[PDB]
Amino acid sequence: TTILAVSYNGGVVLAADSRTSSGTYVVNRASNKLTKLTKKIYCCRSGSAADTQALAERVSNYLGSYQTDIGAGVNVATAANLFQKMCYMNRWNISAGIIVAGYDPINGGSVYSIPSGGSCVKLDYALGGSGSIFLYSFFDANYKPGMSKSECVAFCQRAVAHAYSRDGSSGGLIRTITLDADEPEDQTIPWNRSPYCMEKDPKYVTQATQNQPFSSSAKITGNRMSSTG
Amino acid sequence: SGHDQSTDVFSAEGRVFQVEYAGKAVDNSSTAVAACCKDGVVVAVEKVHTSRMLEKGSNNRIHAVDRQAGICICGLLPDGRAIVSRARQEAENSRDIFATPIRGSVLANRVGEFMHAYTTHFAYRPFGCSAIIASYADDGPQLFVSDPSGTVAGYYGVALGKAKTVAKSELEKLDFSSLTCDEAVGKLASILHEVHDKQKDKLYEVEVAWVCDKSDRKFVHVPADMVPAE
Numbered sequence: 191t192t193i194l195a196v197s198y199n200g201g202v203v204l205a206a207d208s209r210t211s212s213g214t215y216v217v218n219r220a221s222n223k224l225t226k227l228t229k230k231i232y233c234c235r236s237g238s239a240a241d242t243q244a245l246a247e248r249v250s251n252y253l254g255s256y257q258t259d260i261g262a263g264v265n266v267a268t269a270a271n272l273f274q275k276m277c278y279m280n281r282w283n284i285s286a287g288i289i290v291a292g293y294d295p296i297n298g299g300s301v302y303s304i305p306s307g308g309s310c311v312k313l314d315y316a317l318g319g320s321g322s323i324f325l326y327s328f329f330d331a332n333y334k335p336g337m338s339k340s341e342c343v344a345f346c347q348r349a350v351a352h353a354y355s356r357d358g359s360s361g362g363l364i365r366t367i368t369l370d371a372d373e374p375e376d377q378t379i380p381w382n383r384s385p386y387c388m389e390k391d392p393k394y395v396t397q398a399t400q401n402q403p404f405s406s407s408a409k410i411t412g413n414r415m416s417s418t419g
Numbered sequence: 420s421g422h423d424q425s426t427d428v429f430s431a432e433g434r435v436f437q438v439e440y441a442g443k444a445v446d447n448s449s450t451a452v453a454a455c456c457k458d459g460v461v462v463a464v465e466k467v468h469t470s471r472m473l474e475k476g477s478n479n480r481i482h483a484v485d486r487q488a489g490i491c492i493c494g495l496l497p498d499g500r501a502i503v504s505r506a507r508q509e510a511e512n513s514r515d516i517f518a519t520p521i522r523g524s525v526l527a528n529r530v531g532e533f534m535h536a537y538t539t540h541f542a543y544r545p546f547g548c549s550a551i552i553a554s555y556a557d558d559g560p561q562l563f564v565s566d567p568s569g570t571v572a573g574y575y576g577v578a579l580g581k582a583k584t585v586a587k588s589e590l591e592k593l594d595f596s597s598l599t600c601d602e603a604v605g606k607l608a609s610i611l612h613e614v615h616d617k618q619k620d621k622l623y624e625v626e627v628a629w630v631c632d633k634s635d636r637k638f639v640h641v642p643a644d645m646v647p648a649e
């Protein structure tokens with residue numbers, strides 16, 4: 191699982207892969223780790239597939255019962271204190287890394303990263319999942335803050351594609367959605383139209399010369415591809 | 420007869436008398452007034468001291484519920500302190516669970532359901548209290564009044580107490596659209612010194628409190644030298 195959420199001027203861009211894998215076997219290759227809480231507030235979802243699904247639909251029922259009694263819109267800081275309350279009083283029993291990102295008219299675009307420990311940190315961009323450790327040095331070099339909506343979509347799709355190329359846990363589709371003052375626009379690009387893959391990376395075309403022919407010199411001349419020559 | 424002995428008894432015409440008898444405990448209580456001044460809300464009440472030796476600050480009927488809201492009670496003082504200590508608990512819940520200040524129309528709807536829940540059961544009696552919720556939340560300046568029946572209503576101005584009919588006509592001469600919080604402390608305190616008579620009590624003073632943009636959206640009492648003298 192590689193999940194991330196990046197803020198721009200208008201709102202936020204949620205990004206995630208699509209694969210639940212029982213250790214080493216792909217149980218599902220079209221998962222949806224972008225969970226709707228309210229219309230403009232979603233959450234990314236990593237870790238245990240059952241422990242985080244039960245939290246996401248328990249928060250989303252407190253959060254819709256709140257919205258009816260208030261009669262107004264729900265702030266993102268409200269939804270991020272319902273995950274922190276539940277991920278802290280269950281922190282020894284669940285495995286839950288949650289990234290809460292959304293839009294509210296008061297504060298604009300907000301990103302909250304709630305790790306497995308149960309803390310809450312408000313950010314500009316957040317990373318999560320087992321594939322997130324590849325993306326710290328990728329965002330230190332290639333990420334500049336203050337992009338547009340069209341640039342954050344193509345960046346976060348290029349960000350996830352570098353993550354599941356090296357990670358074995360992550361893979362599949364790339365599901366992204368933007369949350370701002372307009373309608374929430376979702377987009378799912380496949381594997382075969384992904385912006386990066388190592389199989390078509392032109393520097394991994396040459397095989398590593400392991401299987402040397404039996405020869406008279408120490409001059410390395412590539413692999414042995416035939417029984418005759 | 421026995422049709423006005425508890426709360427779970429409708430009358431022959433659909434009335435509940437122990438609620439309506441509790442409304443006579445507010446109508447025989449000291450005079451309350453309030454005003455919404457387009458950047459905040461000012462609330463003033465008259466403390467009827469029964470002895471010369473009471474300390475200044477005793478029996479303050481104005482209590483702060485949150486940083487931006489506060490409930491002044493009109494009626495019985497110890498019954499209204501169960502309303503204040505409940506609405507504080509309702510405002511602590513929104514700060515600790517939902518990470519947001521409680522809205523003005525939402526705090527008043529929690530007061531009107533706590534006061535109503537003691538008018539439906541036989542073991543409980545209704546409050547002898549009218550609570551005035553003065554708030555300044557992200558929905559603007561709010562002014563609500565919860566009666567002992569549990570009915571809440573947003574007002575622009577309100578008079579409650581004994582002389583609530585004479586002080587209501589004195590509020591109709593104010594503006595509430597061009598009215599500011601700077602002038603209204605002198606106006607509303609001057610309502611109480613004209614609506615109330617000194618031929619019954621000798622010791623009466625006024626207690627004013629506001630919440631507005633000048634006090635940084637904080638529900639505070641007055642500095643003592645802003646109130647008119649008499």
Ligand SMILES: *[B]([O])([O])[C]([C][C]([C])[C])[N]C(=O)[C]([C]C1=[C][C]=[C][C]=[C]1)[N]C(=O)C1=[C]N=[C][C]=N1
Pocket residue numbers: 191192209210211212213217221223235236237238239240242285319320359360
């Ligand atoms: B992602 O791989 O972390 C994913 C996130 C989930 C919330 C949709 N989790 C899983 O794939 C888990 C296994 C796992 C892998 C790595 C870290 C933690 C957990 N999958 C399951 O829990 C699972 C396994 N078999 C059947 C159903 N669900």
